[PDB]
Every structure is written in structure tokens, then in C-alpha cells.
């Protein structure tokens, strides 16, 4: 097979922003939660952006009679709503799937496994939703593997002292600001 309707997609190349450079005119309010999906978000069978369609877009072709009188028809995939169990998330995740995709999931032995397969083909035939799911699973796996220590209290101890020092000079200091200051330190 091929992933033509996926890998044809192109997204505007964001310029790498240095810390000292000037701002863009429209900077967003809330930050980027998820990683950027290489292949954007489908601009044709937008039905499939909400689910795990397995790179199965709608076809259009011809109904043909005994007289060979051609008439345009479309061929939809066998989509199905299906709440499937994630071991990593410890909850079942309900989404639209192609019956094919459900079969692949069953073969691979789980939904998390399906999401996390490292092949490029899989990545292509994950949606934007599928990509987000993958990210959620992978991040959770990483957390499980590696808890922070294998600092917050020190910051909390120092904060009031820092505030007092600021006041002695003359200025007031709020926590959020303190946190912002001492993130990289």
C-alpha cells in the first residue's frame, strides 16, 4: 500500500525562535500541549481526524451497469465506535475505528501497542487523534519507568526569605514570579 493522502500533506514550516529575537504578531494564548504530528491533520475525510481510521480514506469511483452507464459512487470504510482497554492509561478509550484497524489492534495485542509501534507506516496511519493518544501513552510509560528521583520543598523554603529580601530592598514578589525565576536554576 501507500500513504499518498497522508504524506502529500504539507504544513507551514515554523521558524526556530531564539530567546533574544523579536515576537511574531500572533502568539497563541495557551501553550502547545502535544508534539507536532509530522503529517498535520487531514483536509479531505475530516471524519477520520476524530478516529483511528488506519489511513483508510473515502474512495470515489463509478457505479457501472450492464449498459456500462457510469454514475459516480463513493466507497466508505467500515467504521465502528469501540471502547478498547488501555493498560498504560488504566482506562478504556472509545473511538471510531475501521474494522481493519480493530483487527490490527487485536493482532498486535493491545491498543497501546498499536499506538506505540515505531514504524513510519503506523505513524502515517495514526490520525492526529491517534498521535495524541500515542503521546499520552508514551509519556505515561516514561513516567512509570522514571519517577523524578531514582527541590520543590527547597524552593518553598527559600521563597518567603526571597520575598522578605525583596521587601527590604523595596519591591514585592509573588510566588508565580519566583517559580518563573528559578525554573532553570
Amino acid at each position: 500500500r501507500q500513504w499518498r493522502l497522508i504524506e502529500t500533506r504539507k504544513i507551514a514550516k515554523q521558524p526556530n525562535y531564539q530567546v533574544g529575537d523579536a515576537k511574531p504578531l500572533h502568539m497563541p494564548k495557551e501553550r502547545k500541549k502535544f508534539p507536532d504530528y509530522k503529517y498535520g491533520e487531514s483536509n479531505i475525510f475530516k471524519q477520520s481526524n476524530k478516529g483511528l481510521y488506519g489511513g483508510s480514506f473515502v474512495q470515489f469511483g463509478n457505479n457501472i451497469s450492464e449498459s456500462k452507464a457510469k454514475t459516480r459512487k463513493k466507497w466508505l470504510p467500515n467504521v465502528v465506535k469501540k471502547g478498547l482497554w488501555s493498560e498504560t492509561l488504566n482506562r478504556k478509550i472509545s473511538i471510531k475505528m475501521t474494522a481493519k484497524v480493530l483487527k490490527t489492534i487485536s493482532k498486535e495485542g493491545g491498543i497501546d501497542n498499536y499506538l506505540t509501534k515505531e514504524k513510519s507506516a503506523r505513524i502515517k496511519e495514526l490520525g492526529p487523534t491517534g498521535w495524541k493518544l500515542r503521546y499520552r501513552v508514551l509519556k505515561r510509560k516514561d513516567e512509570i519507568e522514571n519517577p523524578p528521583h531514582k527541590r520543590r520543598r527547597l524552593m518553598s523554603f527559600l521563597y518567603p526569605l526571597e520575598k522578605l529580601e525583596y521587601r527590604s530592598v523595596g519591591k514585592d514578589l509573588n510566588y508565580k514570579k519566583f517559580v518563573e525565576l528559578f525554573a532553570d536554576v
Partner: protein, 49 residues
């Protein structure tokens, strides 16, 4: 935020690092000389015939 690397990807990276760590095959001056001499001999033989 950058997506984390899955297990297979990490293993591949480790393998690549191990490969890099080994001594790299590089074409020595001596090897080039040996080749060049052989080429010359071949040319001489062609000229003769």
C-alpha cells in the same frame, strides 16, 4: 514539546552510538598507492596489447 523515544528507537540509538564508538574504516595512503600501482600496471598491459 518533543515526543519521547519508544523502546525500539532507544535501542537503535544505542546501537548507532556503539557503532560510532568503534574505530572507523578509513582508506589509508598505502592502500591508495597499492591501487594506483595496479591501475598503472593495467594501463601498461592495455598499451602493450
Amino acid at each position: 514539546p518533543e515526543m519521547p523515544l519508544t523502546e525500539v528507537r532507544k535501542s537503535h540509538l544505542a546501537e548507532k552510538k556503539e557503532l560510532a564508538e568503534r574505530e572507523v574504516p578509513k582508506l589509508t595512503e598505502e592502500d591508495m598507492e597499492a591501487i594506483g600501482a595496479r591501475v598503472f600496471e593495467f594501463l601498461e598491459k592495455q598499451k602493450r596489447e
